[PDB]
Design a protein around this ligand. Sequence first.
Ligand code: ZN
Ligand code: ZN
Ligand code: ZN
Ligand code: ZN
Lengths: 327, 328
Amino acid sequence: RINTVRGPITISEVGFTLTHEHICGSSAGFLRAWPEFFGSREALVEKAVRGLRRARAAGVRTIVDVSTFDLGRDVRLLAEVSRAADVHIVAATGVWLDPPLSIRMRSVEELTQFFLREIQYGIEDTGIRAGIIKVAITGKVTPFQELVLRAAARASLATGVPVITHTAGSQRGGEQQAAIFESEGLSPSRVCIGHSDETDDLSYLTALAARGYLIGLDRIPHSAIGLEDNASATAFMGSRSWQTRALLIKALIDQGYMKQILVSNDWLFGISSYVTNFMDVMDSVNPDGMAFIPLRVIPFLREKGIPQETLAGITVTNPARFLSPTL
Amino acid sequence: RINTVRGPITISEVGFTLTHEHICGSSAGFLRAWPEFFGSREALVEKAVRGLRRARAAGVRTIVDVSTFDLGRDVRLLAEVSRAADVHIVAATGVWLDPPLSIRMRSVEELTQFFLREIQYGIEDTGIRAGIIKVAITGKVTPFQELVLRAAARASLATGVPVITHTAGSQRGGEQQAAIFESEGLSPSRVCIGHSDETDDLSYLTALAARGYLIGLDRIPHSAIGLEDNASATAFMGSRSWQTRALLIKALIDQGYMKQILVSNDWLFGISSYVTNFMDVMDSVNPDGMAFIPLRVIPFLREKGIPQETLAGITVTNPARFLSPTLR
Ligand SMILES: [Zn+2]
Ligand SMILES: [Zn+2]
Ligand SMILES: [Zn+2]
Ligand SMILES: [Zn+2]
């Protein structure tokens, strides 16, 4: 069974899954301290519920919210929006790219204990347990990021929950991450090398898929094409089209690696960790929000001749095998 | 009136005040997410209540907890410990040295609105209003720290609540802060240049005092000594004696600026923002905790011939004048 913000669910219940999403991208404590940054907490909830409901109508049954403590994960927000939209949400532990001093001063042993608290006991005082461990690196894995990766591996080995990575910009990084994970004895089948759609290096992608890593092609709608006069949009969303990103899905299928593909949007319904009003920029690029994958990408890939059964295995079977805890 | 974590109090109720203290030095959300780092939340509360009751029995009536959002300020923790210890606690807004992306991506106008929120409306959903604005600088003041200082000056000018600064480094950080605050139209009498005991540069401190700034001599027990095999120690503590720090208090009094002096410990009862068990290092050096000022420093100054009324001016009158919201 898989832990969600509404409690444990069976594999059969998981359904069509978006494996890399966010309700809100923020900072620890920030939503609670300055909700008016988002208009109000109520407005944010409304926007998230509407948008998750549209994804539900398009067939989405589960999302994995890979916001960590330092991304401002508010598991009570997740629970309220999950219940109202009636969509499963898997919450995360781990460490992203903005750890405060209380996190980045910690040892690998301490970080391991923190991840285990969140997986085995619960997040804060809620009893809601994390279903995945999220880590993030910047180009060259820093000494601290390597501690985070080792603790993630150790916590995955103790609990069976999988690890999902943020690979910054387009600098790849999967091979450096995989080296550390394997030095800890972690199976590649418990790891998703995320944001792998940021690169067109098919040799790089295929070699990781061949080792049994899951490949996250998970920022599919992000594109700043047409927004070249907005430097912050280009930096965040890139200059490649969504079709370019989506065609990597086809490319890995064609190389025989359909079982290794996880697809998502990396969307959110509010964001404070970047420039002010950036949510409006994203919303103008992709009005479909989290429904972008079932509404646009799935038909696109059918139109390129990929069988329905193959797309169902990528959107249903792969996420379930990935999320089901496995020692 | 002055806002505390238990509501408004009158100036006469403030009493002997420690104007630069912390219940817990942490990071936003961290006490909620990992209370077992401190043993438990219950263990932290119990230690803080004992430490504050000890301070109260030594004469303290109010502390100013200058923990910002990014220092993990938990006003519910402060309210609980204040009620149990019967010691007033004034809470802070502002930005310290560890702003997350959601804070450090913000404009001066945005940070002004955030500080105003915490002073005028309340912190989080608690209704507890900040009574001071805390800012921190390093070196010669970074562009972001300058933005924070200006937002602080603007929030001070709109509300009358004072500003207290963390002055780090050896670049006479007080003068850079004063120039920025004065460019905004902020009165020096609304500003405490904190951690001014970190230097022995008396001419520098006197000159600031003469301009009307309050001088925070507020890390007196962090002087250390005896902890040479501890690197984290003298990197965060200091290599001076507490008596030499305390003699700056007398030096400024003798120059004629007793009413410009604020004295404190910069203590806490838990800390997660540095090395693990740094709390144990601190407690070993200063077992008096927040009672160090009244138990050690006030007797030391009395022995050096500073009169009662002068000591009461520094510990009761100066903090009341500083904290009372004043648009001048
Ligand atoms: Zn990411
Ligand atoms: Zn993401
Ligand atoms: Zn300080
Ligand atoms: Zn302090």
